[PDB]
Scaffold this active site. Structure first.
Site, PDB file in Angstrom:
ATOM      1  N   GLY A 291     -10.094  -7.537  -7.617  1.00 21.82           N
ATOM      2  CA  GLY A 291      -9.426  -6.299  -8.013  1.00 21.82           C
ATOM      3  C   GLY A 291      -8.084  -6.547  -8.636  1.00 21.82           C
ATOM      4  N   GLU A 292      -7.431  -5.468  -9.022  1.00 19.74           N
ATOM      5  CA  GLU A 292      -6.148  -5.619  -9.729  1.00 19.74           C
ATOM      6  C   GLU A 292      -5.369  -4.316  -9.707  1.00 19.74           C
ATOM      7  OE1 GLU A 292      -7.312  -6.430 -13.819  1.00 19.74           O
ATOM      8  OE2 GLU A 292      -7.691  -4.305 -14.151  1.00 19.74           O
TER       9      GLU A 292
ATOM     10  N   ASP B 105      -3.287  -0.280  -0.891  1.00 19.59           N
ATOM     11  CA  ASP B 105      -2.486   0.075  -2.051  1.00 19.59           C
ATOM     12  C   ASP B 105      -1.275   0.989  -1.851  1.00 19.59           C
ATOM     13  OD1 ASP B 105      -1.378   0.534  -4.498  1.00 19.59           O
ATOM     14  OD2 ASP B 105      -3.158   1.636  -5.330  1.00 19.59           O
ATOM     15  N   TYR B 106      -0.227   0.478  -1.218  1.00 21.76           N
ATOM     16  CA  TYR B 106       1.003   1.217  -0.942  1.00 21.76           C
ATOM     17  C   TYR B 106       2.007   1.294  -2.092  1.00 21.76           C
ATOM     18  CZ  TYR B 106      -1.313  -0.296   3.383  1.00 21.76           C
ATOM     19  OH  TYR B 106      -2.251  -0.558   4.326  1.00 21.76           O
ATOM     20  N   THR B 107       1.459   1.205  -3.291  1.00 25.56           N
ATOM     21  CA  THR B 107       2.225   1.031  -4.509  1.00 25.56           C
ATOM     22  C   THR B 107       3.026   2.303  -4.828  1.00 25.56           C
ATOM     23  OG1 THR B 107       0.708  -0.759  -5.025  1.00 25.56           O
ATOM     24  CG2 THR B 107       1.709   0.393  -6.935  1.00 25.56           C
TER      25      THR B 107
ATOM     26  N   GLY C  70     -12.524  -5.190   3.638  1.00 28.63           N
ATOM     27  CA  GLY C  70     -13.913  -4.869   3.334  1.00 28.63           C
ATOM     28  C   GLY C  70     -14.103  -4.371   1.895  1.00 28.63           C
TER      29      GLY C  70
ATOM     30  N   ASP D 206      -1.559   8.022  -3.046  1.00 27.08           N
ATOM     31  CA  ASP D 206      -2.587   7.535  -4.004  1.00 27.08           C
ATOM     32  C   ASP D 206      -3.836   7.123  -3.235  1.00 27.08           C
ATOM     33  OD1 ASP D 206      -3.509   7.174  -6.542  1.00 27.08           O
ATOM     34  OD2 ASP D 206      -2.622   5.195  -6.830  1.00 27.08           O
TER      35      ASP D 206
ATOM     36  N   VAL E 271      -5.659  -9.269  -7.367  1.00 21.92           N
ATOM     37  CA  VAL E 271      -6.103  -9.409  -5.959  1.00 21.92           C
ATOM     38  C   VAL E 271      -7.247 -10.421  -5.886  1.00 21.92           C
ATOM     39  CG1 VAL E 271      -6.853  -8.172  -3.875  1.00 21.92           C
ATOM     40  CG2 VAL E 271      -5.340  -7.041  -5.504  1.00 21.92           C
TER      41      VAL E 271
ATOM     42  N   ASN F  23      -9.143   3.010  -2.635  1.00 23.44           N
ATOM     43  CA  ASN F  23      -8.193   2.531  -1.646  1.00 23.44           C
ATOM     44  C   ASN F  23      -8.654   2.785  -0.210  1.00 23.44           C
ATOM     45  OD1 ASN F  23      -6.566   1.546  -3.567  1.00 23.44           O
ATOM     46  ND2 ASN F  23      -5.333   3.438  -3.733  1.00 23.44           N
TER      47      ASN F  23
END
Ligand SMILES: Cc1cn(C)nc1Nc1ccc2scc(-c3ccncc3)c2n1
Ligand code: NI
Length: 320
Positions: free
Chosen positions: A21-22, A209-211, A131, A171, A28, A176
Protein backbone atom coordinates in the site's frame (compact mmCIF):
# COMPACT_ATOMS: atom_id res chain seq x y z
CA UNK A 1 22.44 10.27 14.45
CA UNK A 2 20.40 8.62 11.64
CA UNK A 3 20.92 4.90 10.96
CA UNK A 4 21.37 3.10 7.60
CA UNK A 5 18.39 1.30 6.03
CA UNK A 6 20.13 -1.97 7.05
CA UNK A 7 19.57 -1.18 10.74
CA UNK A 8 15.81 -1.38 10.14
CA UNK A 9 15.89 -3.78 7.20
CA UNK A 10 18.65 -6.39 7.51
CA UNK A 11 19.15 -8.65 4.48
CA UNK A 12 16.56 -11.35 5.12
CA UNK A 13 13.92 -8.89 6.37
CA UNK A 14 14.50 -6.74 3.28
CA UNK A 15 14.34 -9.82 1.03
CA UNK A 16 10.86 -10.61 2.29
CA UNK A 17 9.49 -7.04 1.84
CA UNK A 18 6.38 -6.75 -0.41
CA UNK A 19 4.65 -3.45 -1.09
CA UNK A 20 1.02 -3.63 0.17
CA UNK A 21 0.00 0.00 0.00
CA UNK A 22 0.89 3.65 -0.10
CA UNK A 23 -0.13 7.19 0.78
CA UNK A 24 0.45 10.61 -0.81
CA UNK A 25 3.81 10.69 0.98
CA UNK A 26 4.37 7.10 1.95
CA UNK A 27 5.15 3.52 1.02
CA UNK A 28 3.87 0.58 3.10
CA UNK A 29 5.74 -2.74 3.03
CA UNK A 30 4.83 -6.03 4.63
CA UNK A 31 7.62 -8.34 5.84
CA UNK A 32 8.70 -10.88 8.45
CA UNK A 33 10.94 -10.09 11.42
CA UNK A 34 11.80 -12.80 13.95
CA UNK A 35 9.06 -15.00 12.48
CA UNK A 36 6.49 -12.20 12.96
CA UNK A 37 4.64 -10.26 10.21
CA UNK A 38 5.07 -6.50 10.32
CA UNK A 39 3.97 -3.48 8.32
CA UNK A 40 6.60 -0.86 7.58
CA UNK A 41 5.76 2.71 6.61
CA UNK A 42 8.57 4.78 5.04
CA UNK A 43 8.18 8.59 4.69
CA UNK A 44 10.85 10.89 3.20
CA UNK A 45 11.71 13.94 5.35
CA UNK A 46 13.23 17.40 4.54
CA UNK A 47 14.79 17.62 1.05
CA UNK A 48 7.37 15.58 0.48
CA UNK A 49 6.82 16.41 4.20
CA UNK A 50 9.03 18.11 6.81
CA UNK A 51 9.80 16.52 10.20
CA UNK A 52 7.40 18.90 11.92
CA UNK A 53 4.73 17.79 9.44
CA UNK A 54 5.39 14.08 10.26
CA UNK A 55 5.70 14.31 14.06
CA UNK A 56 1.84 14.38 14.56
CA UNK A 57 1.48 11.00 12.84
CA UNK A 58 4.28 9.70 15.11
CA UNK A 59 2.69 10.99 18.34
CA UNK A 60 -0.78 9.79 17.34
CA UNK A 61 0.49 6.37 16.28
CA UNK A 62 2.20 6.16 19.66
CA UNK A 63 -0.79 7.26 21.79
CA UNK A 64 -3.27 4.97 20.04
CA UNK A 65 -0.88 2.05 20.32
CA UNK A 66 -0.68 2.58 24.10
CA UNK A 67 -4.45 2.11 24.50
CA UNK A 68 -4.00 -1.66 24.13
CA UNK A 69 -2.25 -1.85 27.55
CA UNK A 70 -4.11 0.86 29.51
CA UNK A 71 -6.76 0.23 32.23
CA UNK A 72 -9.53 2.92 32.44
CA UNK A 73 -9.59 3.46 28.68
CA UNK A 74 -8.43 0.31 26.94
CA UNK A 75 -8.75 -0.98 23.36
CA UNK A 76 -6.81 -3.12 20.88
CA UNK A 77 -8.88 -1.65 18.06
CA UNK A 78 -5.99 0.45 16.67
CA UNK A 79 -2.60 -0.96 15.62
CA UNK A 80 0.57 -1.69 17.61
CA UNK A 81 3.57 0.55 17.03
CA UNK A 82 6.80 -1.41 17.54
CA UNK A 83 9.40 1.22 16.58
CA UNK A 84 10.29 4.53 14.97
CA UNK A 85 13.61 5.26 13.24
CA UNK A 86 15.21 8.03 11.33
CA UNK A 87 17.01 6.38 8.42
CA UNK A 88 19.55 7.82 5.99
CA UNK A 89 20.43 6.62 2.53
CA UNK A 90 19.19 5.97 -1.00
CA UNK A 91 16.14 3.70 -1.43
CA UNK A 92 17.14 0.06 -1.15
CA UNK A 93 17.01 -1.59 -4.61
CA UNK A 94 15.09 -4.55 -3.16
CA UNK A 95 12.44 -2.03 -2.00
CA UNK A 96 12.39 -0.51 -5.54
CA UNK A 97 11.84 -4.00 -6.99
CA UNK A 98 8.95 -4.53 -4.58
CA UNK A 99 7.71 -1.05 -5.46
CA UNK A 100 7.76 -1.94 -9.18
CA UNK A 101 5.90 -5.22 -8.61
CA UNK A 102 3.05 -3.28 -6.96
CA UNK A 103 3.03 -0.72 -9.74
CA UNK A 104 2.75 -3.53 -12.34
CA UNK A 105 -0.15 -5.29 -10.55
CA UNK A 106 -2.20 -2.62 -8.72
CA UNK A 107 -0.78 0.66 -10.04
CA UNK A 108 0.93 3.38 -7.96
CA UNK A 109 0.01 7.07 -7.81
CA UNK A 110 3.44 7.80 -6.36
CA UNK A 111 6.78 8.70 -7.83
CA UNK A 112 9.13 5.74 -8.17
CA UNK A 113 11.48 6.44 -5.22
CA UNK A 114 14.74 6.06 -7.20
CA UNK A 115 15.74 9.76 -7.19
CA UNK A 116 16.70 9.94 -3.51
CA UNK A 117 20.41 10.40 -2.79
CA UNK A 118 22.50 8.80 -0.05
CA UNK A 119 22.04 11.78 2.35
CA UNK A 120 18.22 11.42 2.16
CA UNK A 121 16.45 11.09 5.55
CA UNK A 122 13.34 9.03 6.04
CA UNK A 123 11.09 8.19 8.96
CA UNK A 124 10.52 4.43 9.23
CA UNK A 125 7.53 3.45 11.37
CA UNK A 126 7.20 -0.24 12.06
CA UNK A 127 3.81 -1.58 13.14
CA UNK A 128 2.18 -4.84 14.04
CA UNK A 129 0.53 -6.37 10.97
CA UNK A 130 -3.20 -5.62 11.26
CA UNK A 131 -4.53 -7.75 8.39
CA UNK A 132 -6.44 -6.99 5.20
CA UNK A 133 -8.72 -4.03 4.60
CA UNK A 134 -12.51 -4.19 4.61
CA UNK A 135 -12.70 -3.14 0.94
CA UNK A 136 -10.74 -6.24 -0.13
CA UNK A 137 -13.10 -8.20 2.16
CA UNK A 138 -16.19 -6.73 0.42
CA UNK A 139 -17.28 -10.20 -0.82
CA UNK A 140 -15.52 -12.39 1.75
CA UNK A 141 -17.33 -11.65 5.05
CA UNK A 142 -19.55 -14.40 6.39
CA UNK A 143 -22.76 -12.74 7.57
CA UNK A 144 -24.34 -9.52 8.79
CA UNK A 145 -23.49 -10.77 12.31
CA UNK A 146 -19.88 -10.15 11.31
CA UNK A 147 -20.78 -6.72 9.99
CA UNK A 148 -22.39 -5.88 13.33
CA UNK A 149 -19.28 -7.08 15.20
CA UNK A 150 -17.11 -4.91 12.97
CA UNK A 151 -19.19 -1.77 13.57
CA UNK A 152 -19.29 -2.50 17.32
CA UNK A 153 -15.48 -2.90 17.37
CA UNK A 154 -14.96 0.33 15.42
CA UNK A 155 -17.45 2.28 17.58
CA UNK A 156 -15.91 1.11 20.85
CA UNK A 157 -12.38 1.75 19.64
CA UNK A 158 -13.27 5.34 18.69
CA UNK A 159 -15.24 5.79 21.98
CA UNK A 160 -12.23 4.81 24.04
CA UNK A 161 -9.96 7.11 22.03
CA UNK A 162 -12.50 9.94 22.46
CA UNK A 163 -12.58 9.37 26.26
CA UNK A 164 -8.84 9.05 26.58
CA UNK A 165 -7.41 11.49 24.01
CA UNK A 166 -10.27 13.47 22.40
CA UNK A 167 -9.42 11.62 19.19
CA UNK A 168 -10.93 12.13 15.75
CA UNK A 169 -9.72 9.74 13.03
CA UNK A 170 -10.98 12.11 10.22
CA UNK A 171 -10.42 9.57 7.34
CA UNK A 172 -11.94 6.22 8.34
CA UNK A 173 -12.73 4.90 4.84
CA UNK A 174 -13.03 1.12 4.30
CA UNK A 175 -9.40 1.00 3.24
CA UNK A 176 -8.38 1.99 6.78
CA UNK A 177 -10.31 -0.82 8.51
CA UNK A 178 -8.19 -3.95 8.79
CA UNK A 179 -9.46 -7.42 9.65
CA UNK A 180 -7.54 -10.39 11.03
CA UNK A 181 -8.55 -13.83 12.31
CA UNK A 182 -8.82 -14.44 16.03
CA UNK A 183 -9.68 -17.62 17.89
CA UNK A 184 -11.04 -15.43 20.72
CA UNK A 185 -14.83 -15.75 21.02
CA UNK A 186 -15.13 -12.39 22.87
CA UNK A 187 -13.08 -9.18 22.58
CA UNK A 188 -12.65 -6.85 25.53
CA UNK A 189 -12.53 -3.10 25.90
CA UNK A 190 -12.77 -0.74 28.87
CA UNK A 191 -14.46 2.70 28.63
CA UNK A 192 -13.96 5.11 31.54
CA UNK A 193 -13.38 2.20 33.92
CA UNK A 194 -16.32 0.03 32.72
CA UNK A 195 -15.27 -3.22 30.98
CA UNK A 196 -17.42 -4.90 28.34
CA UNK A 197 -17.23 -7.47 25.57
CA UNK A 198 -17.93 -7.69 21.85
CA UNK A 199 -18.54 -11.03 20.02
CA UNK A 200 -15.63 -11.23 17.55
CA UNK A 201 -17.42 -13.41 14.99
CA UNK A 202 -13.89 -14.69 14.30
CA UNK A 203 -12.36 -11.27 13.47
CA UNK A 204 -10.35 -8.53 15.16
CA UNK A 205 -10.55 -5.02 13.71
CA UNK A 206 -7.59 -2.61 13.57
CA UNK A 207 -7.87 1.08 12.56
CA UNK A 208 -4.96 2.65 10.59
CA UNK A 209 -3.84 5.79 8.72
CA UNK A 210 -3.66 8.64 11.28
CA UNK A 211 -2.55 11.03 8.58
CA UNK A 212 -5.52 13.43 9.14
CA UNK A 213 -6.15 12.51 12.80
CA UNK A 214 -6.47 14.78 15.81
CA UNK A 215 -6.09 14.35 19.56
CA UNK A 216 -4.78 16.12 22.66
CA UNK A 217 -3.15 15.45 26.03
CA UNK A 218 -2.85 18.17 28.69
CA UNK A 219 -4.32 20.89 26.40
CA UNK A 220 -1.75 20.29 23.62
CA UNK A 221 -3.55 19.54 20.35
CA UNK A 222 -1.84 17.32 17.77
CA UNK A 223 -3.36 17.45 14.29
CA UNK A 224 -3.10 18.03 10.53
CA UNK A 225 -4.11 21.53 9.41
CA UNK A 226 -6.07 21.20 6.16
CA UNK A 227 -7.69 24.66 6.23
CA UNK A 228 -5.68 25.82 3.17
CA UNK A 229 -6.23 22.48 1.41
CA UNK A 230 -8.71 22.78 -1.50
CA UNK A 231 -8.38 19.39 -3.31
CA UNK A 232 -9.58 17.33 -0.30
CA UNK A 233 -12.99 19.07 -0.38
CA UNK A 234 -13.57 18.79 -4.17
CA UNK A 235 -13.76 15.03 -4.79
CA UNK A 236 -16.93 13.02 -5.51
CA UNK A 237 -18.18 9.71 -6.96
CA UNK A 238 -18.16 8.15 -3.47
CA UNK A 239 -19.95 9.25 -0.27
CA UNK A 240 -16.39 9.37 1.20
CA UNK A 241 -15.74 12.81 -0.36
CA UNK A 242 -18.87 14.33 1.22
CA UNK A 243 -17.57 13.49 4.71
CA UNK A 244 -14.63 15.85 4.07
CA UNK A 245 -17.04 18.69 3.25
CA UNK A 246 -19.31 17.84 6.23
CA UNK A 247 -16.36 17.87 8.68
CA UNK A 248 -15.22 21.23 7.22
CA UNK A 249 -18.76 22.59 7.61
CA UNK A 250 -19.25 21.17 11.15
CA UNK A 251 -15.91 22.70 12.31
CA UNK A 252 -15.92 26.01 10.35
CA UNK A 253 -12.55 25.03 8.80
CA UNK A 254 -10.79 25.12 12.20
CA UNK A 255 -9.08 21.74 12.52
CA UNK A 256 -7.57 22.21 16.02
CA UNK A 257 -10.98 22.04 17.69
CA UNK A 258 -12.48 18.81 18.99
CA UNK A 259 -15.57 17.67 17.08
CA UNK A 260 -16.13 13.95 17.78
CA UNK A 261 -19.20 14.16 15.56
CA UNK A 262 -16.67 13.47 12.76
CA UNK A 263 -16.30 9.92 14.16
CA UNK A 264 -20.08 9.51 13.79
CA UNK A 265 -19.97 10.70 10.16
CA UNK A 266 -17.32 8.09 9.28
CA UNK A 267 -19.17 5.26 11.11
CA UNK A 268 -22.29 6.21 9.07
CA UNK A 269 -20.26 6.00 5.83
CA UNK A 270 -19.06 2.53 6.90
CA UNK A 271 -22.58 1.35 7.91
CA UNK A 272 -23.72 2.53 4.44
CA UNK A 273 -20.95 0.41 2.83
CA UNK A 274 -21.97 -2.59 4.96
CA UNK A 275 -25.59 -2.21 3.75
CA UNK A 276 -24.97 -1.35 0.11
CA UNK A 277 -21.61 -2.58 -1.15
CA UNK A 278 -20.92 -5.83 0.75
CA UNK A 279 -21.95 -9.33 -0.20
CA UNK A 280 -22.01 -11.90 2.60
CA UNK A 281 -21.32 -15.62 2.09
CA UNK A 282 -24.45 -16.47 4.09
CA UNK A 283 -27.53 -14.38 3.24
CA UNK A 284 -30.02 -13.04 5.84
CA UNK A 285 -32.74 -15.61 4.99
CA UNK A 286 -33.22 -16.79 8.61
CA UNK A 287 -35.41 -14.90 11.15
CA UNK A 288 -32.33 -14.13 13.30
CA UNK A 289 -30.25 -12.73 10.45
CA UNK A 290 -33.13 -10.61 9.02
CA UNK A 291 -33.43 -9.14 12.53
CA UNK A 292 -29.74 -8.18 12.57
CA UNK A 293 -30.19 -6.56 9.17
CA UNK A 294 -33.11 -4.49 10.45
CA UNK A 295 -31.09 -3.23 13.44
CA UNK A 296 -28.20 -2.15 11.21
CA UNK A 297 -30.70 -0.38 8.93
CA UNK A 298 -32.14 1.31 12.04
CA UNK A 299 -28.58 2.30 13.11
CA UNK A 300 -27.85 3.81 9.70
CA UNK A 301 -30.93 6.00 9.85
CA UNK A 302 -30.60 7.14 13.50
CA UNK A 303 -26.86 7.32 14.24
CA UNK A 304 -26.40 10.81 12.74
CA UNK A 305 -28.41 12.13 15.75
CA UNK A 306 -25.64 11.16 18.15
CA UNK A 307 -22.91 13.58 19.14
CA UNK A 308 -19.97 11.13 19.31
CA UNK A 309 -18.85 7.50 19.11
CA UNK A 310 -19.06 7.44 22.94
CA UNK A 311 -22.69 8.55 22.75
CA UNK A 312 -23.36 5.81 20.17
CA UNK A 313 -21.73 3.03 22.19
CA UNK A 314 -23.42 3.88 25.52
CA UNK A 315 -26.86 4.89 24.17
CA UNK A 316 -27.63 3.26 20.79
CA UNK A 317 -29.98 0.26 20.84
CA UNK A 318 -27.83 -1.63 18.31
CA UNK A 319 -25.30 -2.31 21.10
CA UNK A 320 -27.77 -3.35 23.84
C1 LIG B 1 1.28 1.06 8.20
C2 LIG B 1 0.30 1.95 8.89
C3 LIG B 1 0.06 1.97 10.27
N1 LIG B 1 -0.78 2.99 10.49
C4 LIG B 1 -1.23 3.50 11.77
N2 LIG B 1 -1.14 3.64 9.35
C5 LIG B 1 -0.51 3.02 8.38
N3 LIG B 1 -0.69 3.29 7.07
C6 LIG B 1 -1.08 2.44 6.02
C7 LIG B 1 -1.30 2.95 4.74
C8 LIG B 1 -1.65 2.07 3.73
C9 LIG B 1 -1.77 0.72 4.04
S1 LIG B 1 -2.22 -0.59 2.99
C10 LIG B 1 -2.06 -1.73 4.27
C11 LIG B 1 -1.66 -1.18 5.45
C12 LIG B 1 -1.43 -2.04 6.65
C13 LIG B 1 -1.60 -3.41 6.58
C14 LIG B 1 -1.37 -4.17 7.71
N4 LIG B 1 -0.97 -3.66 8.87
C15 LIG B 1 -0.83 -2.33 8.92
C16 LIG B 1 -1.06 -1.49 7.85
C17 LIG B 1 -1.50 0.28 5.34
N5 LIG B 1 -1.17 1.13 6.32
NI1 NI C 1 16.95 0.61 16.47
Amino acid sequence: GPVPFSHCLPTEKLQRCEKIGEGVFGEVFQTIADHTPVAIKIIAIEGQKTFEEILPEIIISKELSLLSGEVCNRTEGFIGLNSVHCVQGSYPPLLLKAWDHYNSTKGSANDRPDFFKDDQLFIVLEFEFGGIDLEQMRTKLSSLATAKSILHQLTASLAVAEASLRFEHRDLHWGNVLLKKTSLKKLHYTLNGKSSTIPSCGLQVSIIDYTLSRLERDGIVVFCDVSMDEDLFTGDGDYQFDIYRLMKKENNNRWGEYHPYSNVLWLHYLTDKMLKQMTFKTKCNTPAMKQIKRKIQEFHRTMLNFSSATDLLCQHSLFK
